[PDB]
């Protein structure tokens, strides 16, 4: 049951990432995009970063 | 069923096969400080505890692995280092321990005995003659 | 009056390097790609 | 549109690009959107010139937010190709950011130029 | 792409295929650059023969023995 | 060390192994099996596995049944190739080249790779037929089977034209099309070997679209790089370079343009001709030779690509008119003007249409008048070309000594044309300063 | 191409048929062929900075000038009346002549 919930959480994360940031999701995908949003804190907090960052 | 192979054709051993694959020493400066401390551990416990005089030309062995004592389940009140004493290296534990003033006292006695008559002594003798 | 068509070879190398020799588009389609590359129509 | 501190007067545009060329020869210039963002975020930037001929205009719109947070003046020139070969690049430069130092005739020009940009605003 | 997805506005009747346009274009261009970087060829070398002399070089000249029709018998 | 050089040439030219380690290594070289297993394999095990592979290949395609009798025979378990004479070895080479041309289409499949492994491990094709084997594996130069063949190939047994492969034998990576194309522009021998292999296959009708697309792409890029090398700016050197390019190309294109049964190689040769006529600034007689051979060569299957290549060839000519037989077979073309509008949406057919109208007007036949009328009312020519074509038509009407009835009917229809073409035709009448009503009432009375 | 200026109305922002960025210093001379097939443009401030351009194709000729073509620091150029001879005069004061032949 924990695995089924984790799978539907991954599907939800993919759908919410294609809702928020379609360009970055088309580039690298929802999981790595969510990792970047997580480390930066938010979307407009990731957007203030240079490409070297 | 039966596939085309992947052709994969393009010194000292990395891991010891007989000792369950201890990796070769990544000779970091912290591990080098730790190994110098291990060959000088007679000096660290200042005469309270003497050690077996193992003195090879190279103190760094070929295969090492820096680990940590976990736990004896029978003793856990005084045979357990606290959070403000679990340090990163061995030299940090030696410096966080006591008798660092004892090391400094012995070092200054050695420094006086080695500055005893070398060149400041002769500068003082020459000044006392010239006065 | 017309002149000789100037084409950088990297574009034609992209036309042919888009796929291997097998599983390439058929030679009519690749001929239309090369002809539209070498067509002198403004 | 979204380029509201626009430099439309050609005399002011010529003054901006001449000061950009002088700073480029002084190596007091940061070229490109990423390098402009780094200079504005680090706070070394004295003035920042964006270009309004950017085909997606929204790729330089984050710099007005950081300039509003850091109180540096930004201005929009018409042509990014003109900005590029004003810096001496042979590419199209969409945002440039020219910095300050201790004592220069260039620093006096920077102060007068940001006074003219404040007159635009 | 993150700056575009965090600052660009859209008319709210905007399809996702045109909302992810910068991502589509950047991914296609970046895959083309990846396959160029992977299809960079290796360095050429001198192809040597069995002697150690490079291939395609001519050997010494020796007269090949050829049987000819003697024409003194057409008589 | 002249003696060491003579002995090195003898040892490289030698073919049969003469000591036990050499026999074990030469038996160890295989495609499928690893060397540690492939040393200890008799010729019954290899024949059982590879005959299962050939049974699968012979059930796929029908035409492997002579090789079932001659190459994959239970007696061909035992034949040593180095113990037969020169004519037996040459006939075996002919049989092997025919099988390799036949098996080149299915070479991504494991049955065909098992059959090639039988040829390699029994007849030693990697040593005795290195040219045909390397050429038939060259269109698959992106696959691990080509990497393995490159691994088992002897170094000094490769022909001189394929000696670009040496770094890809020293480091076992598949060579890229950039390397093959660059060696094709530098060496004429490699381009001649690839074109000779595919034309020798296509004469035996064992073509496949992978080989046709491979040859078309590499000859197109090789003629591209070859023109960019041959361009010099000096007049006599560019003349000699155009002549050397034509002498290196001409047999291949002169066969592949009129190979009627293979429309794929015909379209690929049309592609090479289009590149050669656009980029390389050639002469008018060379371009009429190309157009006359294309006109002799097309089918219904390559008619519209032939018309595209004909538009490019006629566009890049300095003369104004076409040389006869071109216009004759374009008379024989079914839907000329509608096809030319479909081409002129992308390709500027104006000089072809102008030369066609002039070459029709130069015929005293009167079965070309619907084509002349359609090409004039087509809106394909420019105003000046339409004016000089109508002037040449009225001059031919003055030159004729029935015929004049159809000529006057065509002329009154062209004068009573509707749009801008009719405007330009009546303007051409006004600038030739000859009255409509004279020939009008002359043909009406 | 001056047929692209007509939109008598002139377009305020025409696009170039070709932008040449081969020379790095300021363009000092430019001259069309009198029959309108060549275009020679050159910069004075670099040694041997002269390019020759076909029209209407707008392609820079790559076979001339070479590394050892003695142009000098080109100050003036002139095509002949039949466009058979290009004359190039440099800052040293030396005219040199080149037959154009196609």
Short mmCIF file of N, CA and C in Angstrom, two decimals, chain F residues 2 7 13 48 79 83 107 114 130 166 205 208 212 217 220 241 246 248 284 295 297 299 323 342 359 361 377 392 426:
data_model
loop_
_atom_site.label_atom_id
_atom_site.label_comp_id
_atom_site.label_asym_id
_atom_site.label_seq_id
_atom_site.Cartn_x
_atom_site.Cartn_y
_atom_site.Cartn_z
N UNK F 2 67.00 -4.21 -45.91
CA UNK F 2 66.29 -4.58 -47.13
C UNK F 2 65.82 -6.02 -47.10
N UNK F 7 61.29 -9.77 -46.47
CA UNK F 7 60.63 -10.80 -45.69
C UNK F 7 59.34 -10.30 -45.06
N UNK F 13 52.14 -10.98 -47.54
CA UNK F 13 51.47 -11.60 -48.68
C UNK F 13 51.11 -13.06 -48.44
N UNK F 48 26.65 -26.81 -37.74
CA UNK F 48 25.29 -27.03 -37.24
C UNK F 48 24.60 -25.72 -36.88
N UNK F 79 36.15 -28.33 -47.11
CA UNK F 79 37.03 -27.79 -48.14
C UNK F 79 37.94 -26.71 -47.56
N UNK F 83 44.10 -24.89 -50.37
CA UNK F 83 44.64 -26.06 -51.04
C UNK F 83 44.11 -26.23 -52.45
N UNK F 107 21.26 -7.97 -43.15
CA UNK F 107 22.45 -8.16 -42.34
C UNK F 107 22.26 -7.72 -40.89
N UNK F 114 24.76 -15.23 -38.71
CA UNK F 114 25.26 -16.60 -38.58
C UNK F 114 25.79 -17.14 -39.91
N UNK F 130 38.33 -9.33 -48.39
CA UNK F 130 38.19 -8.22 -47.46
C UNK F 130 37.49 -7.03 -48.10
N UNK F 166 41.83 2.49 -39.52
CA UNK F 166 42.85 2.04 -38.58
C UNK F 166 42.72 2.60 -37.15
N UNK F 205 20.30 -6.73 -59.45
CA UNK F 205 18.95 -6.46 -58.92
C UNK F 205 18.80 -6.91 -57.48
N UNK F 208 18.80 -2.72 -52.07
CA UNK F 208 17.90 -2.51 -50.97
C UNK F 208 17.97 -1.04 -50.60
N UNK F 212 20.91 1.94 -51.14
CA UNK F 212 20.67 3.02 -52.10
C UNK F 212 20.75 4.38 -51.41
N UNK F 217 23.56 9.32 -50.30
CA UNK F 217 24.02 10.31 -49.35
C UNK F 217 25.52 10.52 -49.39
N UNK F 220 26.51 12.24 -52.63
CA UNK F 220 26.08 13.64 -52.61
C UNK F 220 27.02 14.49 -51.76
N UNK F 241 40.10 21.13 -62.96
CA UNK F 241 39.43 20.50 -61.84
C UNK F 241 38.02 20.06 -62.19
N UNK F 246 34.62 15.44 -63.55
CA UNK F 246 33.77 14.71 -64.48
C UNK F 246 34.38 13.37 -64.88
N UNK F 248 36.21 11.53 -62.92
CA UNK F 248 36.03 10.65 -61.78
C UNK F 248 34.59 10.26 -61.54
N UNK F 284 27.66 24.69 -70.45
CA UNK F 284 26.35 24.47 -71.04
C UNK F 284 26.27 23.14 -71.77
N UNK F 295 16.55 12.76 -69.56
CA UNK F 295 15.43 12.65 -70.48
C UNK F 295 15.35 11.28 -71.14
N UNK F 297 16.52 8.69 -69.65
CA UNK F 297 16.50 7.73 -68.57
C UNK F 297 15.27 7.58 -67.71
N UNK F 299 11.57 7.09 -65.79
CA UNK F 299 10.40 6.23 -65.86
C UNK F 299 9.20 7.03 -65.36
N UNK F 323 18.05 21.43 -76.16
CA UNK F 323 18.67 20.81 -77.33
C UNK F 323 17.85 19.63 -77.86
N UNK F 342 3.15 22.83 -59.80
CA UNK F 342 3.45 22.19 -58.52
C UNK F 342 4.93 22.27 -58.17
N UNK F 359 12.17 25.70 -77.87
CA UNK F 359 12.44 24.47 -78.58
C UNK F 359 11.20 23.85 -79.22
N UNK F 361 8.75 25.87 -80.50
CA UNK F 361 8.56 26.79 -81.62
C UNK F 361 9.55 26.49 -82.74
N UNK F 377 -0.16 30.43 -71.71
CA UNK F 377 -1.17 30.87 -70.75
C UNK F 377 -0.93 30.36 -69.34
N UNK F 392 8.96 35.15 -81.63
CA UNK F 392 9.49 34.02 -82.38
C UNK F 392 8.38 33.19 -83.01
N UNK F 426 -0.24 41.47 -76.43
CA UNK F 426 -0.67 42.61 -77.23
C UNK F 426 0.36 43.74 -77.20
#
